[PDB]
Amino acid sequence: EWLQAEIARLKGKSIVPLQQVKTLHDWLDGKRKARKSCRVVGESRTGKTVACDAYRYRHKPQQEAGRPPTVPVVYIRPHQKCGPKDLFKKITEYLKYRVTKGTVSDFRDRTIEVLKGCGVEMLIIDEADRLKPETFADVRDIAEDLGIAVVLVGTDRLDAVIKRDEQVLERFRAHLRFGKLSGEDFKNTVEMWEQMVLKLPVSSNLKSKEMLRILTSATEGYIGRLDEILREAAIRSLSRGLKKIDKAVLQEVAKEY
């Protein structure tokens, strides 16, 4: 049946090439050329993690015959309270090596060995605020012992962690902020989410200026609210046998907050 397959995509996640993502990708290209360590900051659900993943994918590992892969961009997200051993494990496993049993000293030396030769040139640490205060020293040592641009990604929660160590603060001072959208950029984004993401059976014409108040009141300009609303409404509409997102559905979803 048709409806269950639409639900199976609408409960999924997708990537939309917003201009915010483009702007980050030009910036990360400049940092990767300069090997410039830096940070990406901005409120929750602003699209940072999805923009970072899109950068990983477009700069995927290149295979070379019988060599370790060339992996220009390594993306990791630490587990909470990430120590040095946890950091080294995530980096080495990302490069498709297996960690052996060993000391932190073994893990460090093995990680530095494979950060070389795999030709890593950027390290993106998402949820960089999950790093333990002692493991930033190893992150800093990677940044300056190798020609690697380390990009710390977090919310303003990260800046509190950063400013608690002036050696971290002074290495990651350069920054880019993901902001909330508004106005015509929000209108174009809302238009994109109808006509590119949902691709629903019958249009709702989400350029409409009045219902844009309903979105704004729930969405506050968070993309990660906007993308949530429409999938909730569309699944309900297609569950209810409505070929469009009706106002009665959008406002009911937007009322759950």
């Binding site: 999924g12 996640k13 997708s14 990537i15 939309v16 090439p17 993943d53 994918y57 995927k60 590992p61």
Partner: peptide, 13 residues
């Protein structure tokens, strides 16, 4: 254009 995390897992992976 839009992409799926599951496609990207195969395509780039």
């Amino acid at each position: 254009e839009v992409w799926d995390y599951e496609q990207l897992r195969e395509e780039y992976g």
